[PDB]
Amino acid sequence: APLTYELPDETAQLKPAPQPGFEAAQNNCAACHSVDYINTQPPGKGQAFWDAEVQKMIKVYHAPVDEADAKAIADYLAKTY
Amino acid sequence: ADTVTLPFANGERPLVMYPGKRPLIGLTARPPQLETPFSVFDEGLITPNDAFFVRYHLAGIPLEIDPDAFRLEIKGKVGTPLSLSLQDLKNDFPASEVVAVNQCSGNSRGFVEPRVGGGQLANGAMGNARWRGVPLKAVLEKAGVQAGAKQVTFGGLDGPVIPETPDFVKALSIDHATDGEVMLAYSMNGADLPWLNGYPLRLVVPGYYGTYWVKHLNEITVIDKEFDGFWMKTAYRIPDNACACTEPGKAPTATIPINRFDVRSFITNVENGASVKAGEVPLRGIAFDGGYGITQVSVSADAGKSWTNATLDPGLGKYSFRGWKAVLPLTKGDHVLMCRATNARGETQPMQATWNPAGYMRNVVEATRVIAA
Ligand code: HEC
Numbered sequence: 001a002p003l004t005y006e007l008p009d010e011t012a013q014l015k016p017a018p019q020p021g022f023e024a025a026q027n028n029c030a031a032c033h034s035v036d037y038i039n040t041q042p043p044g045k046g047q048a049f050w051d052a053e054v055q056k057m058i059k060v061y062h063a064p065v066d067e068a069d070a071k072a073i074a075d076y077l078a079k080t081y
Numbered sequence: 082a083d084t085v086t087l088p089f090a091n092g093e094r095p096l097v098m099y100p101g102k103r104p105l106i107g108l109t110a111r112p113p114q115l116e117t118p119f120s121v122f123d124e125g126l127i128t129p130n131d132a133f134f135v136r137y138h139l140a141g142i143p144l145e146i147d148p149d150a151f152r153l154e155i156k157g158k159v160g161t162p163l164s165l166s167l168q169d170l171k172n173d174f175p176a177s178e179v180v181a182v183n184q185c186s187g188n189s190r191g192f193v194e195p196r197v198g199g200g201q202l203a204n205g206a207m208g209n210a211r212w213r214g215v216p217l218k219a220v221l222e223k224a225g226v227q228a229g230a231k232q233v234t235f236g237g238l239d240g241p242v243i244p245e246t247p248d249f250v251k252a253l254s255i256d257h258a259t260d261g262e263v264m265l266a267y268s269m270n271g272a273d274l275p276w277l278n279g280y281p282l283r284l285v286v287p288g289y290y291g292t293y294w295v296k297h298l299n300e301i302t303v304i305d306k307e308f309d310g311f312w313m314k315t316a317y318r319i320p321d322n323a324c325a326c327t328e329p330g331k332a333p334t335a336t337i338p339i340n341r342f343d344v345r346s347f348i349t350n351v352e353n354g355a356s357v358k359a360g361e362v363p364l365r366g367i368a369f370d371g372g373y374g375i376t377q378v379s380v381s382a383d384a385g386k387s388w389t390n391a392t393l394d395p396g397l398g399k400y401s402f403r404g405w406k407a408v409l410p411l412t413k414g415d416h417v418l419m420c421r422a423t424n425a426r427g428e429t430q431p432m433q434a435t436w437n438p439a440g441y442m443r444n445v446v447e448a449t450r451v452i453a454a
């Protein structure tokens with residue numbers, strides 16, 4: 001038989017916010033990786049940082065995220081993290 | 082209970098338990114990124130397998146491997162393409178061994194000021210181990226490298242969840258790849274590689290940052306041009322200058338791939354606010370570089386106003402952690418301890434931290450405040 005490896009359960013979650021970008025991030029930002037990538041970034045980095053993060057995911061890594069959602073997500077992130 | 086806080090902003094992390102591993106600092110889960118608690122480095126020169134740090138880029142890591150079916154393919158600009166079993170590597174080729182540090186490009190990124198994006202690591206994305214395996218030189222010589230070869234690429238069993246995301250593939254120069262020190266490691270600290278450390282085979286690139294050390298390595302391609310894959314072309318780039326640095330907030334004008342380690346050192350037996358008894362205080366730690374040899378470690382108890390020479394421990398090899406010990410007279414009160422290493426080509430550590438956009442290569446003189454009583 002082959003050897004196998006068992007990972008612990010994933011538990012990482014996004015910080016809830018009333019901004020619509022919270023749900024858009026939940027729906028778009030956990031498809032490739034866990035959201036602890038986001039939760040552990042340096043704090044209060046602001047708009048330009050998070051705008052750049054989102055654009056990199058889309059342009060470089062080919063995250064299928066449309067323009068309206070990309071803005072909602074970056075705005076939610078900049079305000080929340 | 083089950084969390085720690087690293088000494089930088091937003092530093093809280095879960096302590097997480099993985100098969101074969103002691104509790105480690107959880108950075109990301111999918112894919113796993115696991116940092117080693119600092120205290121581990123005071124436990125001995127060789128980092129135990131169950132403590133060794135873990136770094137991966139893509140979520141499709143292999144979770145079932147049949148070692149008997151596993152094959153290492155050698156292809157491209159070679160006379161005879163090879164398909165090698167683990168049994169072939171162990172039996173048909175001479176074994177070599179090296180004690181070598183693996184350190185991530187971004188080890189200590191969390192301490193970079195101003196803060197930069199990416200893996201927010203403290204100093205625990207490094208470890209030292211005794212690697213055993215086959216010199217890549219021997220396998221390439223068997224295939225027969227052709228004149229005109231320029232680079233060798235390395236790819237493993239992991240892949241992207243979405244096929245448009247670029248595959249993790251790295252390259253080395255042909256002269257580096259065939260140098261005899263670059264190794265196809267099947268063994269780590271006398272055992273098969275832990276799973277998250279690249280079971281059943283990984284590249285070991287002594288003295289080079291961890292990005293090159295391709296895990297779950299199954300595909301080696303000799304090419305007659307420079308590799309232009311994303312993870313060479315765009316990621317893992319440093320400023321093309323002596324300091325591998327820029328003015329904080331500024332992009333470099335030219336870059337090159339990350340390459341050899343710079344000189345690092347740490348005091349391992351004390352941390353911030355530690356109590357020590359006024360008088361002769363025993364200190365110890367580690368130092369390392371890109372393989373030129375640590376020539377000396379100086380130690381200071383007055384924030385670098387004055388230095389005492391540490392005694393270097395007997396060595397395990399030029400690529401290993403080098404242990405050191407010093408005994409310093411400390412008067413009662415607060416003291417800022419520092420250590421600073423230099424290597425045999427005169428590389429050393431800056432007193433003041435530098436910066437680059439990626440937060441790679443940090444090697445500032447480490448300062449630790451203690452209370453002598
Ligand atoms: C697959 C197409 C992805 C989607 C969907 C999202 N991201 Fe991502 N992300 C992806 C990769 C290949 C990486 C690098 C992984 C590594 O370990 O190096 C990342 C990484 C991040 C990070 C860390 C910082 C960085 O590397 O730039 C962050 C903060 C991040 N990703 C955020 C993020 C957000 C907000 C997303 C929704 C738009 C998102 N990611 C989706 C690939 C993919």
Ligand code: MSS
Nearest residue numbers: 134135136137138185186237278291292296
């Ligand atoms: N295959 C693979 N390999 C690999 C990877 C991935 O992702 N994949 N990563 C890198 C990195 S990046 Mo930075 O520079 S660090 C690092 C390393 C780590 O190792 P460990 O995990 O064993 O510790 O690995 C290396 N290898």
